[PDB]
Design an enzyme around this catalytic site. Structure first.
Site, PDB file in Angstrom:
ATOM      1  N   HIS A 250       0.817  -1.239   0.000  1.00  0.00           N
ATOM      2  CA  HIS A 250       0.000   0.000   0.000  1.00  0.00           C
ATOM      3  C   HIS A 250       0.850   1.290   0.000  1.00  0.00           C
ATOM      4  O   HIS A 250       0.258   2.370  -0.214  1.00  0.00           O
ATOM      5  CB  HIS A 250      -1.017  -0.040   1.112  1.00  0.00           C
ATOM      6  CG  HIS A 250      -0.482   0.089   2.488  1.00  0.00           C
ATOM      7  ND1 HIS A 250      -0.383  -1.020   3.299  1.00  0.00           N
ATOM      8  CD2 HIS A 250      -0.176   1.170   3.240  1.00  0.00           C
ATOM      9  CE1 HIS A 250       0.002  -0.644   4.506  1.00  0.00           C
ATOM     10  NE2 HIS A 250       0.180   0.708   4.474  1.00  0.00           N
TER      11      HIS A 250
ATOM     12  N   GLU B 255       0.855  -8.394   0.783  1.00  0.00           N
ATOM     13  CA  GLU B 255       1.052  -7.011   1.296  1.00  0.00           C
ATOM     14  C   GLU B 255       2.535  -6.695   1.440  1.00  0.00           C
ATOM     15  O   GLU B 255       2.852  -5.644   2.022  1.00  0.00           O
ATOM     16  CB  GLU B 255       0.235  -6.802   2.574  1.00  0.00           C
ATOM     17  CG  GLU B 255       0.036  -5.329   2.961  1.00  0.00           C
ATOM     18  CD  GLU B 255      -0.583  -4.446   1.875  1.00  0.00           C
ATOM     19  OE1 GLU B 255      -1.299  -4.992   0.983  1.00  0.00           O
ATOM     20  OE2 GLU B 255      -0.301  -3.223   1.891  1.00  0.00           O
TER      21      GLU B 255
ATOM     22  N   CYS C 220       3.494   1.866   9.786  1.00  0.00           N
ATOM     23  CA  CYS C 220       3.544   0.943   8.621  1.00  0.00           C
ATOM     24  C   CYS C 220       4.998   0.797   8.174  1.00  0.00           C
ATOM     25  O   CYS C 220       5.763   1.842   8.026  1.00  0.00           O
ATOM     26  CB  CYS C 220       2.623   1.400   7.497  1.00  0.00           C
ATOM     27  SG  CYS C 220       0.903   1.462   8.088  1.00  0.00           S
TER      28      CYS C 220
END
Ligand code: TJX
Length: 182
Positions: free
Chosen positions: A41, A72, A148
């Site tokens: 992302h 991911e 993240c």
């Protein structure tokens, strides 16, 4: 404070960079040579900023399992003039649960951050931001936006990178040794 934080600090000091995309600043783990990982992302393009240096991306691969399910993880090869310390020998070979993990973050917003998250569950399937995702690790810590790409470690093992949370729990994508055979 103890041997878990000692291992975490050693990984952060030599094997992380600050990666900036159009989607924000992320902790980025360097694995070997010019190869690093980042959450998918982050939307890595042809150019990325690495410690505020404009850097060409030589290759970027968004990993999926052999069910064609998101993992991911994006593996990035950077046009950087310096290699990472090779830490592939600290990557687990199989999916597992863990005791006493540390999540470590280093950005411009979140420098020198270390979080003892405790027990890590092999969670498996997660609907992450609407996207079916596999090989998810879970920890009972209220993680926030900006963590993240944070590195999840135990003593002597680099086991995942932080990819999301639900306000009460945090979720990491597994790192496996088999992703980085060259
Ligand atoms: N809000 C920025 C920030 C940076 C590093 N930290 C370490 C622990 N808590 C923080 C918060």
């Amino acid at each position: 404070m103890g041997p878990g934080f000692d291992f975490a600090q050693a990984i952060m000091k030599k094997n992380t960079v600050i990666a900036r995309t159009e989607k924000g600043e992320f902790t980025m783990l360097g694995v070997y040579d010019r190869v690093a990982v980042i959450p998918t992302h982050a939307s890595v393009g042809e150019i990325i900023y690495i410690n505020d240096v404009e850097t060409r991306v030589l290759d970027a691969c968004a990993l999926r399992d052999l069910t064609d399910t998101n993992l991911e993880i994006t593996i990035v090869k950077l046009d950087r003039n310096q290699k990472f310390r090779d830490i592939r020998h600290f990557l687990p070979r199989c999916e597992d649960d863990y005791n006493d993990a540390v999540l470590s973050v280093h950005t411009s917003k979140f420098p020198n951050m270390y979080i003892p998250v405790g027990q890590v569950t092999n969670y498996g399937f997660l609907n992450l931001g609407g996207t079916p995702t596999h090989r998810i690790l879970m920890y009972n810590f209220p993680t926030r936006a900006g963590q993240c790409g944070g590195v999840v470690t135990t003593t002597g093992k680099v086991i995942g990178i932080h990819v999301g949370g639900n306000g009460a729990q945090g979720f990491a994508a597994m790192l496996l040794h088999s992703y980085f055979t060259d």
